[PDB]
Every structure is written in C-alpha cells, then in structure tokens.
Amino acid sequence: VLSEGEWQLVLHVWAKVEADVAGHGQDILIRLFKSHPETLEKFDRFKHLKTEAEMKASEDLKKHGVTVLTALGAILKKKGHHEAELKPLAQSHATKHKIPIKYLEFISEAIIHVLHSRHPGDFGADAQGAMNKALELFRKDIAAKYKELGYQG
Numbered sequence: 775v776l777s778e779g780e781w782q783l784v785l786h787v788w789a790k791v792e793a794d795v796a797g798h799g800q801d802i803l804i805r806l807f808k809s810h811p812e813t814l815e816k817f818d819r820f821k822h823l824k825t826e827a828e829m830k831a832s833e834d835l836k837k838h839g840v841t842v843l844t845a846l847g848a849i850l851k852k853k854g855h856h857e858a859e860l861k862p863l864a865q866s867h868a869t870k871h872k873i874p875i876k877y878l879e880f881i882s883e884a885i886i887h888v889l890h891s892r893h894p895g896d897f898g899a900d901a902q903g904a905m906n907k908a909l910e911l912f913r914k915d916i917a918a919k920y921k922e923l924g925y926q927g
C-alpha cells in the first residue's frame with residue numbers, strides 16, 4: 775500500500791508526462807523492444823520493425839504508446855483503487871495478447887528509465903522509489919488476476 779506522500783510523488787511526475795504523452799510512449803516502447811526483444815515479437819502489428827530508426831518513424835507505434843500510457847495514467851490516478859481498470863487489461867493481456875507478468879516488469883523498467891531521462895528534477899530517488907512501488911502494485915494486482923485465470927505460470 776502506497777502512502778499518500780508516495781502517491782503525490784507518483785502523480786507529480788505523471789503530470790509532467792501528460793504534456794507529451796506520445797513522446798513518452800515512443801521512448802518507452804522503443805526502450806522495451808530494444809532491451810527485451812522477445813517483447814516485440816508479441817506485437818504482430820510491430821514485428822516488421824528491425825531498427826530503432828524504423829521504430830521512431832512508425833506512427834502506428836506512436837499511437838499505441840499513447841494507448842498504453844493513457845491506460846496507465848488512468849490506473850495511477852486511482853491511487854490503488856484501480857480494480858475496474860485492471861480487470862479488463864489483465865483479462866486481455868493474459869488471455870488474448872499472451873503477455874507474461876515478467877514482460878510487465880520489463881515495461882515498468884522502461885517507464886522508470888524514460889521518466890528519469892525526461893524529468894530528473896521531479897524524479898529523484900524518493901519519486902523513483904514511489905513510482906517503483908506504484909508499478910509493483912500494478913503488477914501484483916494484475917498477477918492475481920492472471921492467477922485466477924490460470925496464467926500466472
């Protein structure tokens with residue numbers, strides 16, 4: 775359970791993201807795909823992309839980055855009271871997209887890295903720890919739904 779002070783740190787940096795949702799989504803997906811290429815293989819939509827320059831030039835990838843970060847921002851702004859938002863995401867990512875929990879750990883690392891690059895003054899260690907906690911809570915609650923459905927592994 776995050777404290778109120780931890781949530782304020784999370785949402786203070788997140789408010790900085792929402793000024794350029796699409797640029798953050800590109801950086802985060804690109805980092806994810808470069809750092810963990812098995813993740814790219816889960817997107818039929820993106821698996822033709824073989825270079826970082828091709829990734830950066832894809833408008834469809836940029837669109838999907840906005841989809842991802844819009845869903846995550848709606849979850850973070852619930853401060854843990856996010857059952858209604860996680861249900862459908864857990865269900866589609868477990869049963870349709872077939873995304874292991876571990877890949878959610880990978881994208882959490884990419885989110886943290888990109889927020890540190892773009893917002894260092896609002897993402898010192900206290901905020902990095904709080905955001906780590908927020909993303910861990912996201913994964914914990916998604917993993918419980920995966921387990922229900924038979925996909926925790």
Ligand code: HEM
Pocket residue numbers: 813814816817818819841842843845846862863866867871873877878881
């Ligand atoms: C912060 C974590 C994530 C969030 C908030 C998120 C959010 C979303 C949303 C909102 C959609 C569209 C609606 C739906 O299908 O449920 C989507 C689609 C999808 N997601 Fe994620 N996602 C996350 C992580 C991942 C990861 C790590 C992967 C793969 C490694 C992944 C793979 C996919 C795929 C394959 C689709 C369908 C894309 C398409 O072909 O249109 N997601 N995600």
